[PDB]
Design an enzyme around this catalytic site. Structure first.
Site, PDB file in Angstrom:
ATOM      1  N   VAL A  22       1.592 -39.606   9.577  1.00 37.98           N
ATOM      2  CA  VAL A  22       1.305 -39.920  10.950  1.00 37.98           C
ATOM      3  C   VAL A  22       1.469 -38.981  12.092  1.00 37.98           C
ATOM      4  CG1 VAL A  22       1.687 -41.848  12.556  1.00 37.98           C
ATOM      5  CG2 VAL A  22       1.684 -42.414   9.989  1.00 37.98           C
ATOM      6  N   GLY A  67       3.909 -40.771   4.555  1.00 37.45           N
ATOM      7  CA  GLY A  67       2.470 -40.816   4.215  1.00 37.45           C
ATOM      8  C   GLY A  67       2.061 -39.755   3.394  1.00 37.45           C
TER       9      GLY A  67
END
Lengths: 586, 586
Positions: free
Chosen positions: A151, A194
């Site tokens: 992110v 992520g």
């Protein structure tokens, strides 16, 4: 060399004609557009940290890794200009495409480390979902060349949460596995959060010796981060902390995920090694030898692809022979049409791609004498429009291709569906949706090429990208233009009422005329190939002489490991074609 | 009543505690937030053509139609504030929700005729795709109260084309039909092109006497070749045609699609009649008498829902008892936990919703003594975090619910998965994805409630909205906060290096400090309930005392017409629960 039913699949009728008059003007105009697209791609791809800066550290870039990963000349760029949310660098921070990896067509996704070390940016998720969707549609492996920082806090709410955000790809990777479609990953650098999930979700995990993958990084966890507001004092603690730490191996390095957990199946010391690992595991995957599904030896089209630079008019007011396009995209320019003469606004027929059988659907341009049948005699039809017979023929064609497990390549250049109550009574609304139904229930992979115009509902029904389950992806060309309808048509439909009212009121019509022209101008601007690629209206604008490359990739991929089979001698479409040709209702 | 295995399903243990003293401050602050949400909703819904003007001519508004369509009190609003592309009126021009229509829960979508006569606007498509997905996930009918004039031409490139544009729902409606899920529509006004396909794609078509549906508008200038420019002469030609034509009925009116084509199954003279037609056919659809799947008589929670206004702390620093929430959302506050004591950070257990059995998963808040087991003794775990046992318990629980065909309700309030190499070695990254895999392969409908915190990957694995196939939809509350991580932590992590480096180079740190504070502020702003609703992070922010209503609708919808069944006497979860509590491994 030995194939089923030669009388049906070999030496099929040929179509198209030789290019006599080269159209210098058209060619240079198309190439100017293609050139601008290449320039846009070039700058999107090179934006961010310089290659030299990436390489100086012994690390390769996404494009360099891909170059060493895929078989030479097999790369088919996809979504290069995709930037739905308009990031300034014109990129979504990933390099994607279809490529052959050790004998297998694969959807390849490489984190672009030149851009914030592969951080998640607005629009990226959508690009990744299209990647897994393509892999699901074609039943080919999804390959990740991961180097993801995760992110981008800066636009956090645009990439982290939501139904279709950065976490969705992890469920899609599980789905692919569950569907028997392997996901292979080679990881580089740091991949926390992520990136960590992008590392763990695949089927096989190959790691570079200096890479790591983790749930998170732990950071500095100095809970008491001041009252809340950051001040110089507090700033003078973070900096200090940093000093009191320097280097520090992030969590989840090889010493953890290889030696302890065994999550990483194999580790390589060099960047090239990692790619070799990917090739090794992709090589162990299943595939049918292409010959199994061939009905003829691979054969190049019978005419030069470059002729298209002259035969495909950029001027949308000029008609052309669709057969010249077909002749240059399919093997030996062969095409055996299904119900020719019936529904003349469309071409529906059987063709070959490197010996592989596929269905083809394309608009016919030009005047259609004494047509359609539901209008008074003497009526003349318009090539590019859809009428009753064309819609019925396509419904039947798709349904037959579906039964025979044949992929379908759709070539669009349409101005819409016939309108008016004659059309309504002829059931065009019902037939248009029937085609959408036919496609949705087909269970066969499909490819869509918006050659020129993609407008109104015709764009949807003609194997449009709107059929997410069946359409593997779509491309366009320099001659492409997509919009709801003609700008002028929309302008007059939107203001005609005001023009009449104002005139009867003695009011000036100029201001309404200006708005109409502005709208027309806007429609033009937002329908160019450039914008089509940027918004994703097409997954890629392809050079006129690069189109067959995509048709080839799509078809070979479609036949690489099919979920269903219909023996050639048990296919009905070939026989229905013959039958319509010989039978005379007497 | 007469139900299977009373000893397992009736008189399950009860949880929660009565509210001693109400927390006035917490309650007023929560209600203040709910009030702002309601005010935002009122504003977006009223925006556009005034109701008085819509009603001036016997026409009803979307909300008025819905009020006469669904059973009073059954309306469960969804995506009221959804406006992903930030349209100025704060709406996507549709009124959606779950509602009971003639005895059946249905996903209801109504064209907001106060806004450009229901024209397609940016974000609408996505709202419609979520509608069909919810119906697909729950296997309940999708109902359209259509009044769609067309496209907002000035943003046509944002609503007409692309893989997920206005045409996609036509393929989705075909899929629903193919999946055996009915789509019913009642049409009002003019519905050309897009609106035409919304009219023809459904299973059953009911129309108002003055309504019409067509493949496209007839276009005032007939089959006249489009013009690249508009001059005064052409303006007058248009005015001339509108006058010459005068009062003309749009194509596809009742005299066409009812009398001729018969696409419209029934036609009604009054607005209310059309809705009666919808009720008539929805009434013909299949459903199981809820008693069939009940294991107990419906019973309201044993404690007042309003206590939640005191028991759910808005202050994300305050812990609370998750059992109080569970006790107020499920029948008679009953809950039979699965492996209580194992994985103490989570609660996984069986509960009932109006007698219907469901699985429940929720975060436990507070300190977890002598936990986790993979860290030094005496260490303390943090409620809201996910550890090894919690992740293993959930994987097993989900898998068991799936086998037993039980729906699952997820209640989130998490700060993420534990980090660090101890956690990594405990396989938290693998277990997190394993849970995602377990959810993806479950084939059971699920509901997710982000009670407070929805952050990090935990938000994904805890039945996150990111599981598009299984999550029917998600909601939030006034206490909701969704973000990748807390702002301060993100800010420091993002600027820790620039601080230490700039200070060394003897450079001003104020600029960086400001960026950090701006980031922290942005995180807060973009994580508020209203923003979660606007972006769709949650499909709806629900009042504290309205939460059970959605839990009810979801569960009853899930058991309305299931695709798969597991007889109660053949369920393993109930048995596994009992065995864990009685077995003592000697």
């Amino acid at each position: 060399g030995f194939y089923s039913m030669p009388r049906y699949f070999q030496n099929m009728p040929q179509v198209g004609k030789p290019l006599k008059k080269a159209d210098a003007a058209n060619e240079e105009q198309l190439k100017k557009i293609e050139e601008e697209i290449h320039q846009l791609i070039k700058e999107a791809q090179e934006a961010g940290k310089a290659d030299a800066d990436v390489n100086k550290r012994g690390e390769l870039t996404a494009l360099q890794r891909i170059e060493k990963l895929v078989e030479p000349g097999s790369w088919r760029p996809l979504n290069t200009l995709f930037n739905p949310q308009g990031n300034k660098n014109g990129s979504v921070a990933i390099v994607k495409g279809l490529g052959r990896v050790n004998g297998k067509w694969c959807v390849v996704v490489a984190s672009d480390n030149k851009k914030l070390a592969g951080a998640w940016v607005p629009g990226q998720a959508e690009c990744l979902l299209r990647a897994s969707d393509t892999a699901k549609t074609l039943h080919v492996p999804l390959v990740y060349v991961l180097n993801c920082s995760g992110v981008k806090f800066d636009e956090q709410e645009k990439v982290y949460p939501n139904r279709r955000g950065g976490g969705t790809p992890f469920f899609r990777n599980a789905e692919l596995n569950q569907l028997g479609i392997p996901v292979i990953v080679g990881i580089y650098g740091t991949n926390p959060a992520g990136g960590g999930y992008h590392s763990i979700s695949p089927t096989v995990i190959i790691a570079h010796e200096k890479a790591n993958m983790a749930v998170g990084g732990a950071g500095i966890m100095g809970g008491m981060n001041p009252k809340g507001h950051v001040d110089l004092e507090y700033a003078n603690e973070i900096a200090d902390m940093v000093d009191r730490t320097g280097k520090t191996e992030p969590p989840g390095a090889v010493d953890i995920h290889y030696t302890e957990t065994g999550f990483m199946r194999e580790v390589y010391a060099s960047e090239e090694g990692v790619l070799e690992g990917i090739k090794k595991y992709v090589g162990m995957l299943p595939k049918y030898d292409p010959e199994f599904f061939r009905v003829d030896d691979p054969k190049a089209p019978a005419f030069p692809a470059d002729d298209l630079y002259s035969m495909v008019p950029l001027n949308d007011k000029r008609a052309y022979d669709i057969y010249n396009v077909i002749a240059r995209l399919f093997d030996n320019s062969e095409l055996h049409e299904y119900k020719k003469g019936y529904g003349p606004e469309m071409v529906t027929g059987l063709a070959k791609v490197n010996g592989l059988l596929v269905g083809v659907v394309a608009n016919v341009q030009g005047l259609l004498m004494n047509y359609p049948e539901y209008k008074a005699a003497g009526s003349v039809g318009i090539g590019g429009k859809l009428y009753r017979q064309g819609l019925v023929k396509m419904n039947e064609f798709v349904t037959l291709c579906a039964r025979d497990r044949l992929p379908i390549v759709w070539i669009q250049d349409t101005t819409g569906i016939d309108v008016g109550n004659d059309a309504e009574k002829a059931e065009l609304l019902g037939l248009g949706q029937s085609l959408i139904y036919s496609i949705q229930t087909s269970h066969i992979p499909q490819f869509e090429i918006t050659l020129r115009k993609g407008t109104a509902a015709a764009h949807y029904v003609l194997g449009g990208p709107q059929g997410n389950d069946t359409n593997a992806f779509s491309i366009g060309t320099a001659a492409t233009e997509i919009a709801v309808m003609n700008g002028e048509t929309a302008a007059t439909a939107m203001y005609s009422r005001r023009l009449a009212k104002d005139r009867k009121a003695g009011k000036d019509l100029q201001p309404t005329i200006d708005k109409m022209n502005n709208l027309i101008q806007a429609f033009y601007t937002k329908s160019r190939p450039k914008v089509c690629a940027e918004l994703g209206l097409v997954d890629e604008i392809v050079d006129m002489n690069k189109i067959r490359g995509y048709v080839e990739a799509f078809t070979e991929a479609a036949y690489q490991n099919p979920e269903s089979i219909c023996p050639f001698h048990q296919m009905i479409l070939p026989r229905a074609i013959r039958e319509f040709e010989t039978f005379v209702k007497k």
